Amino acid sequence: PVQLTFYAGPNGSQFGFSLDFHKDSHGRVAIVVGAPRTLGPSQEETGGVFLCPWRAEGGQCPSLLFDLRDETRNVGSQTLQTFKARQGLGASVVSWSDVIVACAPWQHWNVLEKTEEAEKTPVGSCFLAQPESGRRAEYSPCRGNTLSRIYVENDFSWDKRYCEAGFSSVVTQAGELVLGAPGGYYFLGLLAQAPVADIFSSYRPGILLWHVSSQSLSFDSSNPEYFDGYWGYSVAVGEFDGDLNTTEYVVGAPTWSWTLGAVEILDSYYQRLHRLRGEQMASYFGHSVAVTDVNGDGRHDLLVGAPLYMESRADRKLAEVGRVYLFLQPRGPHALGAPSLLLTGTQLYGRFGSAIAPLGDLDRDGYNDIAVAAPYGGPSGRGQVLVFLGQSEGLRSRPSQVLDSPFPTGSAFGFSLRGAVDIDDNGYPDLIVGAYGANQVAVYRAQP
Amino acid sequence: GPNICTTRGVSSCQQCLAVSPMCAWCSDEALPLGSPRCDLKENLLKDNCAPESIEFPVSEARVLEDRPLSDKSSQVTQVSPQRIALRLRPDDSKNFSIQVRQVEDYPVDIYYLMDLSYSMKDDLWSIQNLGTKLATQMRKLTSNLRIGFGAFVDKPVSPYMYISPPEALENPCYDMKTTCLPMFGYKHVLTLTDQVTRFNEEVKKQSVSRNRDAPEGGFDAIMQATVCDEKIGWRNDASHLLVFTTDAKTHIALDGRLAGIVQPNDGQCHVGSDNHYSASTTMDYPSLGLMTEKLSQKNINLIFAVTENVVNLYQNYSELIPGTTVGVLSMDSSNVLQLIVDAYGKIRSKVELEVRDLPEELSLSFNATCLNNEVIPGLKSCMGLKIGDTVSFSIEAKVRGCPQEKEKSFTIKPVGFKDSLIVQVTFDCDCACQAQAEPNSHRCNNGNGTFECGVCRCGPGWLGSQCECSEEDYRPS
Numbered sequence A: 001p002v003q004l005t006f007y008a009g010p011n012g013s014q015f016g017f018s019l020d021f022h023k024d025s026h027g028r029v030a031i032v033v034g035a036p037r038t039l040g041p042s043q044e045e046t047g048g049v050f051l052c053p054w055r056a057e058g059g060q061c062p063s064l065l066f067d068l069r070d071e072t073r074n075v076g077s078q079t080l081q082t083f084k085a086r087q088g089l090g091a092s093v094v095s096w097s098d099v100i101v102a103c104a105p106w107q108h109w110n111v112l113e114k115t116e117e118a119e120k121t122p123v124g125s126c127f128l129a130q131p132e133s134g135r136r137a138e139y140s141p142c143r144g145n146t147l148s149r150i151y152v153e154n155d156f157s158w159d160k161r162y163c164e165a166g167f168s169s170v171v172t173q174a175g176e177l178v179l180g181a182p183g184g185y186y187f188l189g190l191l192a193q194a195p196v197a198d199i200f201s202s203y204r205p206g207i208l209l210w211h212v213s214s215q216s217l218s219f220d221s222s223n224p225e226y227f228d229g230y231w232g233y234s235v236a237v238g239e240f241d242g243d244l245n246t247t248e249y250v251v252g253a254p255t256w257s258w259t260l261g262a263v264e265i266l267d268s269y270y271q272r273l274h275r276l277r278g279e280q281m282a283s284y285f286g287h288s289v290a291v292t293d294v295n296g297d298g299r300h301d302l303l304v305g306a307p308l309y310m311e312s313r314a315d316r317k318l319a320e321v322g323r324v325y326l327f328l329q330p331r332g333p334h335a336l337g338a339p340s341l342l343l344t345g346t347q348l349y350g351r352f353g354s355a356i357a358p359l360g361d362l363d364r365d366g367y368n369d370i371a372v373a374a375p376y377g378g379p380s381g382r383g384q385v386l387v388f389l390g391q392s393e394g395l396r397s398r399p400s401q402v403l404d405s406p407f408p409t410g411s412a413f414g415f416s417l418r419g420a421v422d423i424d425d426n427g428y429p430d431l432i433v434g435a436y437g438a439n440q441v442a443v444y445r446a447q448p
Numbered sequence B: 001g002p003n004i005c006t007t008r009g010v011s012s013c014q015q016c017l018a019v020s021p022m023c024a025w026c027s028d029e030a031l032p033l034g035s036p037r038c039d040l041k042e043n044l045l046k047d048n049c050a051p052e053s054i055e056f057p058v059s060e061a062r063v064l065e066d067r068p069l070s071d072k073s074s075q076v077t078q079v080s081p082q083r084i085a086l087r088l089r090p091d092d093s094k095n096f097s098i099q100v101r102q103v104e105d106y107p108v109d110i111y112y113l114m115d116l117s118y119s120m121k122d123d124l125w126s127i128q129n130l131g132t133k134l135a136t137q138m139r140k141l142t143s144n145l146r147i148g149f150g151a152f153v154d155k156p157v158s159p160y161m162y163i164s165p166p167e168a169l170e171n172p173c174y175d176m177k178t179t180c181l182p183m184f185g186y187k188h189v190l191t192l193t194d195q196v197t198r199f200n201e202e203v204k205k206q207s208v209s210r211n212r213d214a215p216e217g218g219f220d221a222i223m224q225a226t227v228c229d230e231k232i233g234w235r236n237d238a239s240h241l242l243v244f245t246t247d248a249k250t251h252i253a254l255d256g257r258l259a260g261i262v263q264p265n266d267g268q269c270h271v272g273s274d275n276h277y278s279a280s281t282t283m284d285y286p287s288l289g290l291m292t293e294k295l296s297q298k299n300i301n302l303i304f305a306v307t308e309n310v311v312n313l314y315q316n317y318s319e320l321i322p323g324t325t326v327g328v329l330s331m332d333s334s335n336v337l338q339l340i341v342d343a344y345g346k347i348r349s350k351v352e353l354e355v356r357d358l359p360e361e362l363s364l365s366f367n368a369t370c371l372n373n374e375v376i377p378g379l380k381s382c383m384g385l386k387i388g389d390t391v392s393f394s395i396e397a398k399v400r401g402c403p404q405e406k407e408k409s410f411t412i413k414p415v416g417f418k419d420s421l422i423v424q425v426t427f428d429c430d431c432a433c434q435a436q437a438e439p440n441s442h443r444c445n446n447g448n449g450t451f452e453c454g455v456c457r458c459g460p461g462w463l464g465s466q467c468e469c470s471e472e473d474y475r476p477s
C-alpha cells in the first residue's frame, strides 16, 4: 500500500479520464494519461496527453506536443475546419510498437461548402504520435465530405456525422487498430479496423480527409431493436469460433434492446457469430466487456459488468449494488447459453461493475485473475476496486482484495483503470487508476 | 373494625378525612366513648348520625363542553368532550374516558415532471391533460392539496444539442427552419401550492424543445424534485406523490459518458435563484438506487405514466423499483387515475396525544382501545389509523395532597390536531361544616376555645373533649 505513487497535472483539468501503457521501440515504458480539459497555450480547455515516465515521486509530467491549433484547410471548393475547442483530447489512449494513438471523440469537425455545412459534430479524430521519428499524423474514418442533407435523404443510413470515433480502442496482435464508436449510425454504433502502417504511409500533411483502402467499417443494421442501443460502447478482441488466424470482435452494448443491453461476438468480417443477453434489466449490462480464459483451457470467456444491477438479501428490498456476469465458451463448436456465473458486490450504490480491467494472472500459477471497478463504493461512498481471483471452475463471488479510495469525496476513484501490463518488469501487472475528480492518477503495484 | 380512619386521627375534620378518602364525619353530637366521626361510612350509618349533615365528599367529573364528534358544517369536532370540569380530594384517584375521531382529510403534495422533447411534441398535448385532469381527481377527493410541476429535456451539452451554426445554441431547430426554445436539463416551473388555476396556466405556457438522442434526462429531474425542499416546499406532515411523463426512452446512469459527464448526481439541491440545473453539465444521471432511496426517505410514491408503445420498459422499471406504479399515458388516463386512487387509499395516519400545563406532582396512567377492540396498557397510540375510526383512551389521574392553588387548568393536545381538551380541576381541602366557624362558644368551657363540627379545639395544648383538661393538669397515672 505504501508504494502507491501519484501522478498530477495542470490544475483543474480532470487529469485521469483515461489511462494506458506505452512501450516505445527504445524500450522505455511510460503511462499515457488523457486529460479532456487540459489548458493549452491559448488558455482554452481542449485536451492534453501526458506521457508520464516511471517515476517514484510522480507529479507533473511533460505534456507531449500535439497539433492543438485549428486547421482551416481549403480543398475542392470546400473548407475543412477542425474545431479543437473543448475537444476532450485523450479520452482513449493506446500504444503499439512506437506509435501512440490518442483519440478525441469530442473533437468537432466541420465542412463548409456554400450555405450548406456538415456541422461541427463530434466525429472523433485520433492523433498518431511517433516521437522517435517525430511524426504527428491524424486518422478519422468518421470524417467525410458527405453533407447532412445526403444522410437525411437516405433515412440516415450509414450515418457517420456523430460517430464519436475513438470511444473504445484496441490493438490486435497482427498490428491492426480497431476503434469502436457507439455514436456511429446515429448512436447505434460502429467499428472501424485499419492497419497502422497503411494509415501512416498514406498520411500527408495538410489534408485532413483521405479515403483509406484498408479501412473496414461495420455493417449497418435496420432492425429497430438496435436503435439507440450503443452497439460499440465496449470493444474487445479475442477468439471464440476456434479460428486462431482470424480475430473475432466482442461488442458490449449497455442500452441494446430497450435498455436491456447485450454482448455480440462477431467474426473479422463484422458478421454476427453469437449473441448474449443479460438477466436483469436497467442494470447497464455492457458498459465494459472483457475477453479472457478464466478457466484456462484455450477458449476465451466473456466478462460483463452491470454497475446498476439491483439485488436483494432480506425483506425483499431491491438495492442497487451491481453485478458481474461470466460466460464460459463450451468445448467444441457449441453456442454459448445462459451466463456461466453471477457475482454480486457488497457496498450499496457503489456502481460495482462499471469498468473491468483484466489482470491476467496474479500469482502466476495458471489461474487467471481480474479486477473490477466500484467508482463510488466503500463505507464512505468515494470509490472501490475489487480484485477477483479466478478459478478453473469460474470466478469466486467474494473478491480476494479490495482497494479503497484515499482521495476526497467526489474523486470518483476507480472510474477508469487498466492492467495486464508491467512497468517495473517484476513479472506481475501494475494497476493504474485514473481518478479524474482529484486530477491525479494512482499507480499501485499488485504484490501477491 | 378500627380500620384506618379511626386510628392516627380524630383531631379535626380536615385531618380526620385526610387519613383516607373512605372516611366520614358525624357533625351531630353523639356518644364520644365509641370514638365516632372517623370511620367507614357503613359504620357511621350503623351508628346513625345522618341529619343531612354527613360530610363524605367524593370526586365527581362534570362535563362542560361535550359537542358530538363529526360523523360525515362549521364545527369540525375532532375531540369529544371538549371542556371538562373535575373536583378532586387529596390522595384520590379517578378515571375518565376520552374519544377521538378523525375528521380532517389527509393532506397531499403532488409533483409533476414533464418532458419537452421534440418527439414528445406529438404526445405533448396529452401529457398536459394528464396533469390538469389528475388535479381534478384530487380536487373531488380531498380539500387540502398542493400541486407543483417541472419540465426537463436533456443535459445542455454536446451531442445532446446542436452547436453549428451558432444560432443553433439559441435555436437548435435550424435544419427544419422552425423556432424552438433552447433545450435545458431541468427547469422547475411551479412550486407546490394550492393555486390550481396558476398551475394549469403555467403547464399550458410550456413549449417544446429539440435534442439529438432519443433518451431524455428524466432521472435528473426526478432527483432534483425529490432532493430540493425549500424550492419545492414539501410538507413533512403530508403524503407525497410524484408523476413523471414521457413518450420515449429515458437516460440512465453512466449515459453522460457519451457527452463527457461522469460525476454522479448526489443528494443535494443545485437550483437556487435561477430555476435551472446549474451543475447539469457537471453531474451525471442518477441511478435507480438513488431515486429509490430519496423516495423512501421522503415517503414519495412515483407513478410512471407512459404510452403503450414502450409501456413494457416502465413496467420492468416498476418491477425493479419497489413502491412505484405504471400507467398508460394516452387519450384516456383511467389507468393512471385508478392507480393514483389505489395509492391514496393506502395512506395511514397516527393518533398520539400529549398533556401540558400539569404539575409533576399528579400521576397519570392510560390504556388504549383502538378499532381492534383490544385493550392495551402502556401504549398511547396504535398503528394503522384510518379516517372515521374512533379511539377511546381511559386516563386515570391520581393526586396526592391538596395544592395551595386550589384551582388548576391543563390541556390534552392530540398530535397534529389543533383541537384540544381543556380540563379544569378544583380541590376542596376544608370541610363544609367548618364554614360555621363559631370562634367562641360557651361549650368550649365558658367561651375559652374554638368549636368545629362537634369538637372543641382550645388553647396551645387543651385537648379534652370538653376543653377543660388544661395543658399542665390532666396527668393521670
Ligand SMILES: *[C@@H]1O[C@H](CO)[C@@H](O[C@@H]2O[C@H](CO)[C@@H](O[C@@H]3O[C@H](CO)[C@@H](O[C@@H]4O[C@H](CO)[C@@H](O)[C@H](O)[C@@H]4O)[C@H](O)[C@@H]3O)[C@H](O)[C@H]2NC(C)=O)[C@H](O)[C@H]1NC(C)=O
Pocket: A011, A012
Ligand atoms: C487550483 O488549485 C487550488 C489549490 O491552491 C485549488 O483549491 C483552491 O485553492 C485556493 C487557494 O488560494 C482557494 O482560494 C483561497 O480561498 C481562501 C479561503 O479558503 C482565501 O482566503 C484565505 O483564507 C485563509 C484561511 O483563513 C488565509 O490564511 C489566507 O491568507 C486567505 O485569506 C484565499 O485568499 C484564496 O482565495 C480556492 O477556494 C480553492 N478552490 C477550491 C474549489 O477549493 C483549486 O480547486 C484548483 N482549481 C480547480 C479548478 O480545481
Ligand SMILES: *[C@@H]1O[C@H](CO)[C@@H](O[C@@H]2O[C@H](CO)[C@@H](O[C@@H]3O[C@H](CO[C@@H]4O[C@H](CO)[C@@H](O)[C@H](O)[C@@H]4O)[C@@H](O)[C@H](O)[C@@H]3O)[C@H](O)[C@H]2NC(C)=O)[C@H](O)[C@H]1NC(C)=O
Pocket: A279, A280, A281, B312, B313, B316
Ligand atoms: C422487460 O420487458 C420485456 C417486455 O417488453 C420482457 O420481455 C420478456 O422476455 C422474456 C425473455 O427473458 C420472454 O420469455 C421468453 O423469451 C424467449 C426468448 O428468450 C430465449 O431464452 C432462451 C433461454 O431460456 C434462449 O436459449 C433463447 O435463445 C432465447 O434467448 C421466447 O422465445 C419465449 O417465447 C418467451 O417470450 C417473454 O415472453 C417476454 N415478454 C414480453 C411481453 O415480450 C422482459 O422479460 C422484461 N425483463 C425482465 C427482466 O423481466
Ligand SMILES: *[C@@H]1O[C@H](CO)[C@@H](O[C@@H]2O[C@H](CO)[C@@H](O[C@@H]3O[C@H](CO)[C@@H](O)[C@H](O)[C@@H]3O)[C@H](O)[C@H]2NC(C)=O)[C@H](O)[C@H]1NC(C)=O
Pocket: A245
Ligand atoms: C493461417 O493458417 C494457415 C494454416 O491453417 C497458415 O498457413 C501456413 O503458412 C505457411 C507459410 O506462411 C506454410 O509454410 C509453407 O511450408 C511449405 C513447405 O511445406 C513451403 O514450401 C512454403 O514456402 C511455406 O513456407 C504452412 O505450411 C501453412 N500451414 C499449413 C498447415 O499448411 C498461415 O500461416 C496462417 N496465417 C497467419 C497469418 O499466420
Ligand SMILES: *[C@@H]1O[C@H](CO)[C@@H](O[C@@H]2O[C@H](CO)[C@@H](O[C@@H]3O[C@H](CO)[C@@H](O)[C@H](O)[C@@H]3O)[C@H](O)[C@H]2NC(C)=O)[C@H](O)[C@H]1NC(C)=O
Pocket: B095, B096, B366, B367, B368, B375, B376, B377, B378, B394, B395
Ligand atoms: C385501562 O386499562 C388499565 C390496564 O392497565 C386498567 O387498569 C386495571 O383496572 C382494573 C379495574 O377496572 C383493575 O382491577 C383490579 O385489580 C386489582 C389487582 O391489581 C384487584 O385486586 C381488584 O379486585 C381489581 O380486579 C386492574 O388491577 C387494573 N390494572 C390492570 C393491569 O388491569 C384500567 O381500569 C382501564 N381503564 C378503565 C377506565 O377501566
Ligand SMILES: CCCCS(=O)(=O)N[C@@H](Cc1ccc(OCCCCC2CCNCC2)cc1)C(=O)O
Pocket: A155, A156, A157, A158, A159, A185, A186, A188, A220, A221, A222, A227, B117, B118, B119, B120, B209, B210, B211, B212, B213, B214, B215
Ligand atoms: C427524426 C430525426 C430527428 C430526431 S431529433 O434530433 O429531433 N431528436 C429527437 C429524439 C429522437 C432520436 C432518434 C430518433 O431516431 C433516429 C433514427 C436513427 C436511424 C438509424 C438506424 C441505424 N442506421 C442508421 C440510422 C428519433 C427521435 C428529440 O426528441 O429531440
Ligand SMILES: *[C@@H]1O[C@H](CO)[C@@H](O[C@@H]2O[C@H](CO)[C@@H](O)[C@H](O)[C@H]2NC(C)=O)[C@H](O)[C@H]1NC(C)=O
Pocket: B095, B096, B097
Ligand atoms: C371510571 O370509573 C368508574 C368507577 O370509579 C366507572 O364506573 C362504572 O360505570 C358503569 C357505567 O358507566 C357502571 O356499570 C359500573 O358499575 C361502574 N363501576 C364502578 C366501580 O363504579 C366508570 O365506568 C369508569 N369510566 C368512566 C368513563 O367513567
Ligand SMILES: [Ca+2]
Pocket: A241, A242, A243, A246, A247, A248, A267, A268
Ligand atoms: Ca473466426
Ligand SMILES: [Ca+2]
Pocket: A293, A294, A295, A296, A297, A298, A299, A300, A301, A328, A329, A330
Ligand atoms: Ca473457455
Ligand SMILES: [Ca+2]
Pocket: A361, A362, A363, A364, A365, A366, A367, A368, A369, A389, A390
Ligand atoms: Ca491466479
Ligand SMILES: [Ca+2]
Pocket: A421, A422, A423, A424, A425, A426, A427, A428, A429, A430, A445
Ligand atoms: Ca509490475
Ligand SMILES: [Ca+2]
Pocket: B119, B120, B121, B122, B123, B247, B248
Ligand atoms: Ca412521441
Ligand SMILES: [Ca+2]
Pocket: B153, B154, B160, B211, B212, B213, B214, B215, B216, B217
Ligand atoms: Ca435526449
Ligand SMILES: [Mg+2]
Pocket: B117, B118, B119, B120, B211, B213, B214, B215, B216, B248
Ligand atoms: Mg425526446
